[PDB]
Every structure is written in structure tokens, then in C-alpha cells.
Amino acid sequence: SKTITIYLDHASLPTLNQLMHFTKESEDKETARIFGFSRFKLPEKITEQYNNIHFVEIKNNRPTEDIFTILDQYPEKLELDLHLNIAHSIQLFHPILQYRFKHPDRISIKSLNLYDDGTMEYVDLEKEENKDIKSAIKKAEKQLSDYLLTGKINFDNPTLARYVWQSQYPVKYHFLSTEYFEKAEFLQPLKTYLAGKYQKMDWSAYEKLSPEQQTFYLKLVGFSDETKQLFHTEQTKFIFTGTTTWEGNTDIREYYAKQQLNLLKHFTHSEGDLFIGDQYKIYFKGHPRGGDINDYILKHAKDITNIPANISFEILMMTGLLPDKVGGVASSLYFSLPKEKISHIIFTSNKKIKNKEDALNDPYVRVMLRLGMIDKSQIIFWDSLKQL
Numbered sequence: 001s002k003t004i005t006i007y008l009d010h011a012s013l014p015t016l017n018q019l020m021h022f023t024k025e026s027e028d029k030e031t032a033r034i035f036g037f038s039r040f041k042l043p044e045k046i047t048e049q050y051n052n053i054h055f056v057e058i059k060n061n062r063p064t065e066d067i068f069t070i071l072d073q074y075p076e077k078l079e080l081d082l083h084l085n086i087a088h089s090i091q092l093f094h095p096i097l098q099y100r101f102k103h104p105d106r107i108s109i110k111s112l113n114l115y116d117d118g119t120m121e122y123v124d125l126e127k128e129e130n131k132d133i134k135s136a137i138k139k140a141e142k143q144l145s146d147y148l149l150t151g152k153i154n155f156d157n158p159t160l161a162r163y164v165w166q167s168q169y170p171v172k173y174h175f176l177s178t179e180y181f182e183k184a185e186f187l188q189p190l191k192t193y194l195a196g197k198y199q200k201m202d203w204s205a206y207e208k209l210s211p212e213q214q215t216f217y218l219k220l221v222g223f224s225d226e227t228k229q230l231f232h233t234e235q236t237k238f239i240f241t242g243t244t245t246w247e248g249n250t251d252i253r254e255y256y257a258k259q260q261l262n263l264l265k266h267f268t269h270s271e272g273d274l275f276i277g278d279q280y281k282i283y284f285k286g287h288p289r290g291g292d293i294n295d296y297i298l299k300h301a302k303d304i305t306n307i308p309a310n311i312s313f314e315i316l317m318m319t320g321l322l323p324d325k326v327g328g329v330a331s332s333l334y335f336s337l338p339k340e341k342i343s344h345i346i347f348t349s350n351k352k353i354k355n356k357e358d359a360l361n362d363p364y365v366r367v368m369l370r371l372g373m374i375d376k377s378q379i380i381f382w383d384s385l386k387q388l
């Protein structure tokens with residue numbers, strides 16, 4: 001066989017993981033890789049050292065037909081190691097299935113590594129609390145069997161269907177929060193079904209890396225020495241973390257930036273509802289896909305060290321550069337933080353939240369209550385805050 005290692009992700013959290021996986025094999029310059037992001041994302045000094053590396057576009061949660069053209073170039077017998085995100089695993093797989101119908105004996109699936117895309121996985125599970133989890137698993141297994149036979153997507157329970165890949169392939173899951181699966185009683189049947197099949201997105205597997213692997217990785221993910229110097233001062237440190245939306249609308253986008261800067265004001269200003277104290281030096285960490293929203297913040301923010309948006313927050317924990325305090329809008333990044341470092345986590349919603357009972361029905365709120373990253377007495381959505 002020839003092995004082909006296919007990384008289908010471009011979102012920050014799964015791609016951060018996948019880039020470390022790749023790092024562990026980086027000396028092998030020969031093996032074929034496919035990445036689901038731009039050829040320009042990574043340093044060309046690094047990528048041009050690789051002989052069988054290609055980059056493919058993901059559109060509407062599927063790789064484009066370029067992946068067919070890329071795999072057509074390998075006439076040998078092929079084993080595919082797929083790395084894909086849990087939330088969209090079904091859609092991302094659709095074209096791989098299509099291609100296998102054309103090349104069944106030459107094209108086999110050696111393994112799946114399935115990583116959380118973010119917190120969507122967790123807010124979708126919240127909606128499943130009163131359902132019969134045991135039978136949903138069985139139903140999903142059969143429907144995945146049909147998917148593999150027909151190539152057609154039909155799942156009664158798309159959320160739970162994400163977790164039944166083991167009934168067809170060798171699979172290993174990497175979870176943002178293993179605890180959610182132990183602490184959520186309704187998920188006991190799922191926890192049992194998946195026993196042995198999962199690990200946590202640890203980030204302590206960065207320690208395991210060679211000192212040289214470490215240096216390579218940091219160049220992949222874009223952490224330089226400048227960025228390291230940003231934290232030289234012995235002064236104590238607060239990082240404001242930003243967010244984004246997946247919406248092309250001006251006003252939805254401006255709304256965001258406006259709310260967010262305002263929110264920053266409330267942590268930093270002594271007139272603020274969340275004022276942290278004058279001891280802290282302030283840093284900004286924009287959302288990787290926040291674009292203009294990050295810009296607006298940097299246009300208006302006095303007295304603030306930017307940590308370039310494209311650097312995933314979790315690198316700070318790997319490298320030991322984590323601050324004393326962190327605050328901002330709810331994000332996957334908080335799931336990595338020791339609790340004493342949290343200043344405040346703020347929520348958003350399309351629904352106007354008028355009271356505590358509205359608040360409690362928010363599924364992100366529920367996730368964080370379930371994991372005890374917040375308690376009930378302090379729930380804040382950012383519209384309820386005032387302009388400063």
C-alpha cells in the first residue's frame with residue numbers, strides 16, 4: 001500500500017491538533033499528505049520540503065472534487081488515514097465514499113481520527129437530554145451502514161450519528177471535554193459505547209515532543225519569538241478574548257464589534273461592571289476568523305498588547321505563557337483554562353434574554369453550568385450590558 005494521510009479541517013481547534021499530529025511525522029518527507037486549507041497558510045520554507053503534499057478546498061463541509069484529481073495521481077494500492085471534525089464528519093466523508101465506489105479494491109480506509117470542531121458538538125448534545133440514547137445509537141449504526149452502501153445521508157438523529165463510526169472503522173475521538181461525557185448522566189449509554197475509543201484534547205502531548213519538533217510546530221501555527229517577547233514584563237496579565245460570527249451581513253458584523261469593544265471596556269475601566277483592577281496589564285486575543293471584528297477592536301483600544309488573531313489561544317498554555325486572568329465571550333478556549341484564571345465568561349444569543357429563566361435555557365449556558373465553569377448567580381449576556 002501507499003499511505004495517504006488526509007487532514008480535512010481548517011477550523012482552529014481541530015487544525016491545531018492535526019498540525020501536532022503532522023509534527024510527530026514531520027521528518028518523513030515522502031508520505032503523501034492532503035490538507036483542507038490554503039497552501040499559503042503554512043510557511044513555504046517548510047512545505048516546499050515535502051514531495052507529496054497537496055492542499056484542497058473545503059466548501060459546504062465537503063472537500064471539493066480536486067481531492068479526486070489528487071488521489072487519481074496515486075495509482076498504487078492506497079490506505080487512507082482520515083482526520084476530520086466530529087460535527088461535520090458525515091458530510092466531509094461523502095466525497096470519499098463517492099470515490100471509493102469507483103475504486104473499491106485499491107482504495108481503503110485505514111483509520112479515522114475525529115476531533116471536536118469546537119463547542120457546537122456540546123451545545124447540540126444538550127438538546128438530546130430527554131431522548132432514548134441507547135436506541136438512538138442502534139438506529140444510527142444501521143443508518144451509517146446504509147450510508148456506506150448507498151452513499152446517501154439519512155439519519156434520524158444527526159447529533160448522535162456523529163459518534164457511531166466505530167461500528168465501521170478503526171476510530172479514535174479527541175474531545176474538547178471528556179468530563180462532559182462523565183458528568184452528563186443522560187449520556188451514560190454513549191460513554192459506555194465509546195469506552196476505550198477516546199482521549200481528551202490534552203495539549204500535554206506537546207511536552208512529549210522533541211525540542212526540535214516543538215520548534216517546527218511553533219513555526220507551523222505561527223508562534224514566533226516576538227509573540228514570546230509580548231509576555232516579557234513581570235507585571236500581571238489579563239487577556240481579553242474575542243469572538244466572531246459566520247455572517248456576511250454588515251450590521252450583524254458591526255453589532256459584534258461594537259458589543260465586543262464595549263465588553264472590553266467593562267473589564268478594563270473602573271466604571272465597568274467587570275473591572276478587574278489596575279494591577280493587570282491588558283492584552284487582546286482576537287478570534288482567528290474574526291477579521292474586521294478584530295480590526296475594529298485594534299482601531300479603538302487604548303493601551304493594549306495585541307496577540308495576533310491567527311495564533312490559537314491554546315498555544316499559550318503549551319508554551320507556558322498563560323496570563324493570570326482571562327475574560328471575554330464564551331469560546332472553546334475556556335475549556336482549556338484552569339478555573340482560577342477566569343475573570344468572566346460572557347454569552348450571546350439571537351433571542352433577547354430578559355431574565356434568569358431565559359438564560360438557563362441557553363444551550364451554551366447549560367453546557368458550562370453542567371461542567372461547573374460558571375454558576376447561576378452571575379450569568380451575563382452582552383446586550384444586557386450598557387454603553388460606556
Ligand SMILES: Nc1ccn([C@@H]2O[C@H](COP(=O)(O)O)[C@@H](O)[C@H]2O)c(=O)n1
Nearest residue numbers: 012013241242286287312313331332333
Ligand atoms: N479569541 C479567540 C477565540 C478562539 N480561538 C481559537 O478558536 C478555537 C475555537 O473557539 P470558538 O469556540 O470561540 O470558536 C479555540 O479553541 C482557539 O484555538 C482563539 O485563539 N482566540
